[PDB]
């Protein structure tokens, strides 16, 4: 109806401003992988572990390339 569409606008707004904070901090993420990371951080997860996960997968993608 209406309240199911206002939330869609209010989540497009935050997924844009989080991308802006991502690009001034020069993180290598894009719009698609950031939507995975914010979803993971919603349920409650250690950022010190998930950041180590990403810093290992991005270090192992170069040995295969």
């Amino acid at each position: 109806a209406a309240a199911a569409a206002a939330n869609l606008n209010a989540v497009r707004e935050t997924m844009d401003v989080l991308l802006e904070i991502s690009r001034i901090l020069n993180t290598g993420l894009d719009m698609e992988t950031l939507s995975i990371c914010v979803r993971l951080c919603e349920q409650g997860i250690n950022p010190e572990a998930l950041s180590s996960v990403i810093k290992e997968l991005r270090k192992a993608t170069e040995a295969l390339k």
């Binding site: 869609l8 606008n9 989540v11 497009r12 997924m15 939507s35």
Partner: peptide, 23 residues
């Protein structure tokens, strides 16, 4: 799924008598 719907086509309309959430 919701971030997949979030990639939609937005309406860039606005009025002066509609300030809060007016697409």
């Amino acid at each position: 799924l919701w971030e997949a719907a979030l990639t939609y086509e937005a309406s860039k309309r606005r009025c002066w008598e509609r300030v809060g959430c007016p697409p």
